[PDB]
Structure 1
């Protein structure tokens, strides 16, 4: 029969651990680092592009920061293709919610749903889990600015500042060292860049190797704005913060 070739992706180890989840996380650990920092007036998402070339078209590129809603975005760490599958279903779930209640989906509801989908590949079906971890950065009128993180297991949690991908241990200590509850978006933008700058496995931290995004509530308006920085914009903010 076929039983002979079945890896049994959804079983427990004698220690009560899920093999595939553990190995998928191991995979995630080699992915470009992604950082999320939540300030009083906004959220910052910064990620390091894994592997690049002179010929890579950075303008038309995106492999880490994706827009889910107009008020929610995610930073990716892991298999880009796996991420896109989950990102798309996430985008649909946001719209079903809107079409149903005529209100934008509250951040946690969208995050929980996506996490439940992952949890599924963990308990049934015999398929491999998704090799992806997300940092969600969104805003809603019930909890305001929020930062979440979900991984292959299907577990998700909220944070003031957090990282996923490679060198998370190092990045978390650096963040847990200079983060302050009353920070400001611009402060976070800087903290983020510094952290990546110290954890990178590369020579220097140039703009071509980065993706940046901020979700602010532009005072001169009253609504929430998502800004996915363009190459030039990242190059600027890079000089200013003193990384040139």
Structure 2
């Protein structure tokens, strides 16, 4: 019968590893680097677009940074198509929570549920896992500013600063070197860009090959604002830190 052609996506290796999860992580390691840095007064999300073409429409484009609700955003590393399936699910889950409790969903609860879906694809169903790693940047009134990452295994962890995709080894060393706890958003913005600028496989880091977003309390009195940076705004912040 059909047994002949079954890859068996949800099995262990002799060493006790999940083949398909390991190979999905290998896939993600070739994806454009995404960095999350959590400051005391906000969060930075920086992501490198995959080898841009000059005729790509840059201003009306979304590849890396997606909005889940007013308080939570994600940086993507891996298959974009896979990420959009999970993002629409996460957006619905957030609205289900709000509809049920009349309160915005706590960041970890959204992350856990999205990570539980990924876990499912590794244990049952005989389907390939989602070739996606997320950086979750969000705020709630319990833990304040939070950074999480999830990967195809469905395992998630919290971070002060983290990188996913390509050159994470090199990127994590540079973040570990220059990061400190009393850091501001404006300083975190500079760290995020400087780290990409050194770890990039490109000749020079330019505005057209970046996606950038902040989650500050920079709005008027005790409320959170999500800023998805425009091309011209990235061009200005890149000059202001002295990279171009």
The interval holding the TM-score normalised by the smaller chain is: over 0.9
SS at match of 2:73: strand
C-alpha deviations, 1:17-63, integer Å up to 9, x for none? Answer: 00000000000000000000000000000000002111000011010
The Cα shift of 1:219 comes to 5.5
- Asked if 1:151 corresponds to 2:187, the answer is no
Structure 1 gap ranges (5+): none
The Cα shift of 1:218 comes to 1.4
The Cα shift of 1:141 comes to 0.2
SS at match of 1:118: helix
Q: Is the 8 A contact 2:36 2:45 kept in 1?
A: yes
1: CA distance between counterparts of 2:185 and 2:218?
11
Alignment partner, residue 193 of structure 1: 193
| 1:53–1:219 CA distance, 2 compared to 1 (3 A) | closer
The Cα shift of 1:220 comes to 2.9
2: CA distance between counterparts of 1:179 and 1:105?
29
TM-score of the superposition, structure 1-length normalised? 0.99
1: CA distance between counterparts of 2:191 and 2:98?
35
2: CA distance between counterparts of 1:103 and 1:51?
40
Q: Is the 8 A contact 2:219 2:225 kept in 1?
A: no
C-alpha deviations, 1:83-137, integer Å up to 9, x for none? Answer: 0000000000000000000000000000000000000000000000000000000
2: CA distance between counterparts of 1:219 and 1:85?
31
Structure 2 gap ranges (5+): none
- Asked if 1:36 corresponds to 2:32, the answer is no
SS at match of 2:193: helix
2: CA distance between counterparts of 1:241 and 1:51?
23
2: CA distance between counterparts of 1:181 and 1:220?
25
Root mean square deviation of aligned Cα: 0.6
Deviating beyond 4 angstroms after TM superposition, the runs of 4 or more aligned structure 1 residues are none
The Cα shift of 1:139 comes to 0.2
Q: Is the 8 A contact 2:149 2:158 kept in 1?
A: yes
Q: Is the 8 A contact 2:46 2:210 kept in 1?
A: yes
Alignment partner, residue 2 of structure 1: 2
C-alpha deviations, 1:175-203, integer Å up to 9, x for none? Answer: 00000000000000000000000000000
Q: Is the 8 A contact 2:208 2:231 kept in 1?
A: yes
The Cα shift of 1:221 comes to 2.8
| 1:70–1:239 CA distance, 2 compared to 1 (3 A) | same
C-alpha deviations, 1:144-185, integer Å up to 9, x for none? Answer: 000000000000000000000000000000000000000000
